[model samples]
Target: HSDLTFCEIILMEMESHDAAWPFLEPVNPRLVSGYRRIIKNPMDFSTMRERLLRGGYTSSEEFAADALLVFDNCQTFNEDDSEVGKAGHIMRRFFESRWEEFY
Candidate 1:
């Protein structure tokens, strides 16, 4: 069941991480102004938790897919010098190492 645990473990670490605060919840389209417009698929850690619980209910590969999307979107939407971007760059490296477990 390590595979089952993997998704949740990564989700937990991400939420616990200070750098991951912005990704803990869904971005508010109304508040952010054009966030949803630019990104085709928006994802966050909490949403991943929900989906993982539901199993939606399946693969670790799928879980990794969603994780990558979060960082990918993160990089796409912000400048590297920006606070959010700095988090993304670091967090992307963080998740990259973890996700590589099954890669």
Candidate 2:
């Protein structure tokens, strides 16, 4: 179906959002202690684009799962008042809203 196409479109829009900065690239595992451990599945916008292109996501649900995983990891790894945390909040909200829009 065309569901994944819409997922890709939503992802593109999320990348364009200002709050997308923090989630644009993969987090450096060495940059933060236990970053790789605490986050079992690390994800980012760029990675999503690659996965989308390679057919890694079989459905929109899979795509949405990874998209939110980036934020979920952010929530667990960052504090609410921190800059990265705030960006994650805004970015997650934007993605959720758009997901519904294209649903």
Question: Which candidate has the highest lDDT of all?
Answer: 2
Off by over 4 Å in 1: 101-103
Residues 1-103 of candidate 1 have per-residue lDDT tens digits of: 6887877887888889879987989989989877988989999888998898877847788888898999989888888899999999878898988777656
> Clashing residue pairs in candidate 2, if any?
none
Q: When superposed on Cα atoms, how far off is each prediction in RMSD?
A: 1.4, 1.2
| Candidate 2 lDDT tens digits, 23-97 | 899999878788988888889999999989898888889898998899999999999899999999999889889
List TM-score per model, in order: 0.91, 0.92
TM-score top scorer: 2
What clash count goes with each model?
0, 0
Evaluated at residue 22, the lDDT of candidate 1 is 79
